[PDB]
Design a protein around this ligand. Structure first.
Ligand SMILES: Nc1ncnc2c1ncn2[C@@H]1O[C@H](COP(=O)(O)OP(=O)(O)OP(=O)(O)O)[C@@H](O)[C@H]1O
Ligand SMILES: C[S@@+](CC[C@H](N)C(=O)[O-])C[C@H]1O[C@@H](n2cnc3c(N)ncnc32)[C@H](O)[C@@H]1O
Ligand SMILES: [Mn+2]
Lengths: 279, 136, 370, 566
């Protein structure tokens, strides 16, 4: 009722514009965290996307997100959105189409942020995540690692950095951890995860503008690969129970799709928000 | 396939080593065509047939076409060096012996996926590095 | 008898403190906002008042509801009448109920274990510079836009003179060490972020005329927290909760620690600052206001000082709280933490008396020196 | 005997409390006006002056920049300090009366309280000092030493009342905002002592079209409406409007090691009056040639220069303007400091020069950010203040590193309407600068050497290969020619052999100058034992990649000037 974790689970390729000056080839770049240089979505972007989804519900938007711009009533929003951090990203493999890549440092940051925010039903999650991390560190013994949790997925190749994923047959992965971190999950060092999510490895697309067969303009766009998983913390202030319940149920309904990103008409940034479950 | 500067330096050293670039920075003009055609031969015929064709020394070629295979082996060996050795790494950092011909090595060691990638990148580096010299 | 609490603020995200230029003023370039490193002490007061009525469940919720004549004096005995009105600076009491004393905001480094809290202070403007004032020979005076002043001589205290191309004491922060000063750069303590913000404006006929702004957000480093001391009477148990400290929904974790009631917080702050004292100086620890700086200049041989700007949001108990906020009638110019006043022979008690005559400011956490 | 020294005004703070072209002009010329009427008494009555050459036509308005720096030390007579003080508050009083002249769009005007604010804000400091010696080259350092530390006092304007109606306590805001006035323009005392607005009129001053007149006719508070009017007037002037007609160039320059030059002249018994002569002649010629080019002089006639110039007028670049400014400064230095020139340059010494900072942005993207970008380019890039500042923060500095400080550099950035920055820096000493200028003169079309646009992307994509070629010392020129011939080896490329060889020679010269300036510096920075890796990485400049980037940015500037959206 105070702090709930939400997972984004993008269905398409996301482009959230950083709006910063460019030194390089890609004219349009995606947002990244200043400290970790990991892809992220600003709280303003999340609030805007969810507000646009709920725009037809005037009362719900007014109660949760607040007054519209250039409206004279000046109503603050009862809901505080926190920055969305990249949890899991798809990674090209050979045994399977892609792999769910979660780095040990992102797991540590998730545990730290769960402890800091005291997320709802996060005690068991923190305990089990810490057991997973401790077992991973025990197996790794300070060396770089790539750990899968399916016996079928052992020996998978991460193409970009050329590392083989081994299966630690002594570490358990609880079902709720599969539901959170993703299916076909590989755990690797942050050294490899940084390479897998830098500006040279995540997709770059060329885009054109044609005028009776004449190319008027040329530029390049970079996007976040689809099926990527991002987590953000929602602080539900002491608000109306009915509007909070309606908003939570609509967000968690599998029929909902939220567009966070730029290129809406060409299907960029459509996502499915899910809140943390028990365990 | 972005330009890899380290592979370009490897290609420069290997081109000088396998007596392609003369003391004056010039090379036989036909080698340009050799490097350009090796990649197409690898792609549309197979790695082993292309290597066998370019490794042959009984050829009616205007120059020593087999020198490019030696340069390829030198670039590949240089890439095997400076490989981050760890338990998880797929890449085999084992150097190709000089007595073994390149065709035999891929025949005896049947993991072509690494060899194919290395040979393709080494050929690209070859073609890009040959342009620093005069095309006599 | 009074009860004293130590309140520590931990930032849960990027924060922002507004300066004189805000994103929607009537001035020219109202799309770039820059963030002050510290909140105003009036923001601390509003924080405490808001949380106090939050615990007692006394707010304004939506229409401009009026309060019956029991909530009125319960808010009187809770917070008082007004915000931090700088008009009543010469009032020998805090104009606020329950709350009696608020220390200047402190930069605290919490590293690991219980250990200790490293209070961080701005560098005095003469860190390794020895000032050698008038060798009294009747010659070579200065006119500081005014009356006589005896020719400061600044040497590198380690000869040459003061070279201003290598002067950087205003970019440094300092803390207690094992008999030497530990110097931390300002950019290591804080991280700056510039945000691009828009209104997507999709609809059909809206005028795309103001749909672009630039916001500056600051982030404290991981092992760094804000803290201050409070004094509360008629004990209202200030509980730990999630707070707001101003600026685009800034969220902080309030931890309330109880200290011994037989302790005034002022000399606790001055004990923290004791490691920066020199007999010939007056180190300005918190922003200092004087109605006439000419008098202060006349009572010193040097003012190695800087200017800071103050503008407060003025709101009463029966205020809208949901409309345009009536900001302070006057922008006030305070000195900067780290400024030093080099008094003449004697007259130290006189400048102390001049500084301490503002009791509202001193109680609020302003005009604190060592 | 003793001397009297003067410092005037918190100039940077007054500039910051201002945002307009009128604003930037008005603050600087207000400080120049204060200087003029504070030193009018000590110069009208003859006093041997040695800091400026305050004679000739400085008091005469040339075009309006302000030729008066705030560094004044006269000779002294018995009883001039009281003279100075009473005329100081007297000139403050006349300024308070001048603002109290109802020639502006004012509402209510006070005199005494405006004077109180002005006294509490404007910092006018006098230094009296018994310098027991007769030599200027020793007098100036000894008094500047004290005025620098004196400048650390702060003057407080305690409290302002700036919301509504007629009671606000700040008045510099109106003295600085509503210069000129109502529409036919009116004038303020700034304008009377002086004898141009928006951002676009001096970006397209080539079409021989008077946007001010038509905009005034259309409009007939002010700045926004006329800004929009100028915008849409040169919008429907689309017929001959090139993409460089909507880009604004801000030029900022400062003198390099002026105090060091003074100290070097002191060794050779050379008066500072010659330096004053050279600086004043350079400033006059700078104003003349800046208005001749088609730009606008804004800031000063001291050792700085802030100019607002169009990118290209009458086939003349902003880079042509910078080259002419550098040549004018060098000519004045040589002409007046000829003695110092042939006395200290034979054995070895660098002569005084000026570093340049240029920012080219859209006419939109407000000029406050562009001005700060220009300040950064001049300070921390052109003058190598990143190196010095970073080392001084960690208390390394020391004489070994200080001898590696580089000056006489030009830094420029181009932010196209999108967010792509083209930023490089190059030395104005040596042949690389002249080759750069000749290349820009060559391949920029007039209103007929041809330009190839695909070489630009070759430079970017093949940057690593070009780095290898440049680092190969023995056969660098041969390898560069072979690379540029093997690439671009098609029939269409035979017409661009002049471009290729020009690029090769400029790149080789840039690399040679880069290695000479930076190699030992980078080596010693790498060995430093307290520098963090972040600081080492932002301080270590790769000699070859910087030259490649300079050539790339020069080529992209040529293409940006040449190509029209047709
Ligand atoms: N007319 C003049 N004659 C001689 N010197 C002058 C004159 N006008 C100004 N100066 C000198 O200009 C100096 C100010 O220069 P400034 O501080 O901008 O640059 P700098 O410190 O020499 O250069 P840099 O930052 O490149 O090291 C003053 O020290 C003053 O002595
Ligand atoms: C006077 S010293 C620096 C002192 C600095 N102006 C101050 O007020 O403390 C030289 C510098 O002052 C600035 N300056 C001097 N006279 C100026 C004027 N009239 N207008 C604007 N800037 C000026 C220029 O930046 C120049 O490089
Ligand atoms: Mn200067």
């Amino acid at each position: 009722m105070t702090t709930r974790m939400y997972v984004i689970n993008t269905l398409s390729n996301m482009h959230v514009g950083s709006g910063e000056v460019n030194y390089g080839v890609i004219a349009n770049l995606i947002q990244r965290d200043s400290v970790t240089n990991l892809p992220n979505i600003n709280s303003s972007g999340l609030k805007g996307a969810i507000r646009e989804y709920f725009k037809e519900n005037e009362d719900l938007v007014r109660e949760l997100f607040g007054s519209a711009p250039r409206d004279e009533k000046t109503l603050p929003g009862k809901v505080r959105f926190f920055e969305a951090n990249l949890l899991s990203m798809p990674v090209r493999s050979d045994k399977v189409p892609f792999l769910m890549a979660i780095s040990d440092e992102v797991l540590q940051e998730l545990i730290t942020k769960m402890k800091f925010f005291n997320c709802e039903e996060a005690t068991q999650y923190i305990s089990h995540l810490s057991t997973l991390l401790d077992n991973i560190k025990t197996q790794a013994q300070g060396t770089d690692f790539a750990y899968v949790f399916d016996p079928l997925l052992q020996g998978a190749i991460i193409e970009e950095v050329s590392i083989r994923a081994t299966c630690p047959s002594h570490i358990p992965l609880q079902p709720s951890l599969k539901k959170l971190l993703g299916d076909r999950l590989v755990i690797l060092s942050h050294k490899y995860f940084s390479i897998l999510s830098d500006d040279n490895h995540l997709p770059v697309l060329s885009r054109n503008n044609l005028e009776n067969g004449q190319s008027a303009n040329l530029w390049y766009e970079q996007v976040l690969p689809r099926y990527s998983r991002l987590y953000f913390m929602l602080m539900d202030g002491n608000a109306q129970s009915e509007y909070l319940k309606k908003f939570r149920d609509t967000l968690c309904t599998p029929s909902t799709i939220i567009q966070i990103g730029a290129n809406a008409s060409i299907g960029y940034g459509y996502c499915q928000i899910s809140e943390l479950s028990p365990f | 396939m972005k330009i890899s500067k380290k592979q370009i330096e490897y290609a420069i050293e290997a081109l000088r080593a396998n007596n392609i670039i003369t003391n004056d920075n010039q090379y036989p003009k036909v080698f340009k065509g050799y490097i350009s055609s090796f990649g197409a031969a690898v792609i549309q015929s197979g790695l082993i047939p292309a290597i066998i064709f370019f490794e042959n020394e009984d050829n009616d070629a205007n120059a020593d076409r087999h020198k490019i295979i030696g340069v390829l082996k030198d670039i590949i060996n240089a890439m095997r060096q400076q490989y981050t050795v760890t338990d998880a790494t797929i890449l085999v950092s084992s150097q190709i012996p000089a007595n073994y011909s390149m065709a035999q090595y891929i025949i005896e060691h049947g993991n072509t996926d690494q060899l194919l990638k290395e040979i393709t990148e080494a050929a690209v580096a070859m073609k890009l590095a040959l342009r620093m010299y005069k095309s006599e | 008898m009074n009860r004293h609490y130590l309140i520590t603020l931990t930032p849960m995200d990027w924060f922002f403190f507004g300066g004189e230029r805000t994103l929607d003023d009537g001035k020219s370039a109202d799309y770039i906002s820059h963030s002050n490193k510290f909140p105003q002490q009036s923001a601390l007061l509003g924080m405490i008042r808001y949380q106090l009525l939050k615990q007692h469940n006394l707010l304004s919720q939506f229409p401009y509801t009026e309060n019956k004549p029991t909530e009125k004096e319960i808010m009187k005995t809770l917070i008082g009448e007004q915000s931090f009105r700088m008009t009543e600076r010469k009032a020998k009491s805090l104009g606020l109920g329950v709350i009696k004393q608020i220390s200047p905001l402190m930069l605290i480094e919490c590293k690991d274990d219980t250990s200790s809290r490293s209070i961080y202070f701005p560098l005095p403007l003469d860190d390794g510079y020895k000032v050698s004032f008038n060798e009294t020979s009747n010659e070579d005076k200065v006119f500081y836009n005014g009356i006589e002043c005896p020719i400061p001589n600044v040497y590198p205290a380690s000869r040459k003179f003061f070279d201003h191309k290598t002067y950087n004491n205003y970019l440094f922060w300092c803390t207690q060490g094992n008999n030497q000063i530990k110097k931390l750069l300002s950019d290591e303590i804080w991280i700056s972020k510039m945000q691009i913000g828009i209104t997507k404006h999709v609809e059909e006929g809206e005028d795309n005329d103001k749909s672009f702004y630039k916001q500056e957000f600051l982030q404290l480093k991981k092992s760094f927290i804000y803290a201050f001391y409070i004094t509360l009477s008629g004990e209202s148990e200030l509980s730990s909760d999630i707070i707001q400290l101003g600026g685009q929904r800034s969220v902080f974790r309030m931890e309330v620690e109880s200290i011994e009631e037989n302790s005034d917080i002022q000399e606790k702050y001055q004990t923290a600052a004791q490691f920066l004292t020199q007999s010939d100086r007056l180190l300005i620890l918190s922003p200092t206001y004087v109605d006439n700086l000419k008098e202060l200049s006349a009572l010193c041989n040097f003012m190695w000082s800087d200017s800071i700007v103050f503008r407060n949001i003025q709101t009463t108990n029966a205020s809208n709280f949901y409309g345009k906020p009536i900001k302070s009638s006057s922008k006030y110019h305070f000195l900067k933490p780290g400024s030093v006043l080099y008094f003449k022979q004697g007259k130290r008690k006189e400048v102390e008396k001049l500084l301490m005559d503002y009791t509202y400011l001193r109680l609020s956490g302003y005009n604190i020196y060592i | 005997m003793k001397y009297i020294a003067i410092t005037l005004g918190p100039i940077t703070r007054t500039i910051e409390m201002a945002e307009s072209t009128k604003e930037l002009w008005a603050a600087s010329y207000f400080f120049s006006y204060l200087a003029k009427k504070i030193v009018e008494p000590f110069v009208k009555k003859n006093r041997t002056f040695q800091l400026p050459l305050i004679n000739e036509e400085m008091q005469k308005p040339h075009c309006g920049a302000g030729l008066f720096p705030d560094r004044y030390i006269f000779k002294s007579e018995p009883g001039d300090l009281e003279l100075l003080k009473q005329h100081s508050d007297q000139v403050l009083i006349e300024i308070a009366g001048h603002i109290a002249s109802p020639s502006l769009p004012g509402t209510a005007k006070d005199v005494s309280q405006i004077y109180h604010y002005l006294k509490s804000y404007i910092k006018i400091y006098f230094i009296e000092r018994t310098l027991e010696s007769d030599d200027p080259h020793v007098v100036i350092p000894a008094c500047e030493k004290y005025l620098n530390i004196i400048e650390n006092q702060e003057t407080f304007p305690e409290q302002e009342e700036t919301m509504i109606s007629h009671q606000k306590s700040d008045f510099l805001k109106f003295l600085i905002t509503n210069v000129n006035g109502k529409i036919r323009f009116t004038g303020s005392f700034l304008t009377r002592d002086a004898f141009f607005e928006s951002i676009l009129e001096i970006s397209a001053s080539e079409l021989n079209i008077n946007i001010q007149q038509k905009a005034l006719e259309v409009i007939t508070k002010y700045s926004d409406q006329i800004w929009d009017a100028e915008e849409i007037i040169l919008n429907d002037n689309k017929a001959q409007l090139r993409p460089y007609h909507k880009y604004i160039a801000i030029i900022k320059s400062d003198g390099d090691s002026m105090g060091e030059t003074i100290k070097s002249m002191g060794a050779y018994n050379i008066p500072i009056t010659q330096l004053s002569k050279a600086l004043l002649s350079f400033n006059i010629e700078s104003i003349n040639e800046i208005v001749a080019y088609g730009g606008k002089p804004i800031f000063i006639g001291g050792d700085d220069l802030l100019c607002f110039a169009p990118v290209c007028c009458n086939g003349n670049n902003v880079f042509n303007l910078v080259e002419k400014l550098s040549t004018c400064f060098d000519q004045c230095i040589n002409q007046h400091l000829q003695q110092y020139i042939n006395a200290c340059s034979e054995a070895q010494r660098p002569l005084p020069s000026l570093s340049f900072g240029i920012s080219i942005t859209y006419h939109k993207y407000p000029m406050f950010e562009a001005l700060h970008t220009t300040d950064y380019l001049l300070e921390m890039v052109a003058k190598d203040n990143l190196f010095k500042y970073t080392l001084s923060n960690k208390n390394i500095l020391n004489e070994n590193m200080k001898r590696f400080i580089l000056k006489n550099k030009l830094a420029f950035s181009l932010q196209k309407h999108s967010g792509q920055i083209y930023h490089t820096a190059m030395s104005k000493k040596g042949k690389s600068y002249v080759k750069f200028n000749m290349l820009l003169q060559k391949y920029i079309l007039k209103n007929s050497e041809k330009f190839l646009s695909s070489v630009i992307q070759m430079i970017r994509a093949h940057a690593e290969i070009l780095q290898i070629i440049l680092q190969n010392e023995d056969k660098r020129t041969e390898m560069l020619k072979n690379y540029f011939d093997n690439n671009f080896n098609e029939s269409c490329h035979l017409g661009y052999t002049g471009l290729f060889e020009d690029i090769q020679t400029l790149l080789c010269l840039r690399y040679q100058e880069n290695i000479q300036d930076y190699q030992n510096r980078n080596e010693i920075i790498q060995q430093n034992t307290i520098l963090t890796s972040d600081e080492k990485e932002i301080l270590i400049v790769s000699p070859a990649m910087d030259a490649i980037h300079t050539i790339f940015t020069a080529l992209q500037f040529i293409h940006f000037i040449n190509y029209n959206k047709d």
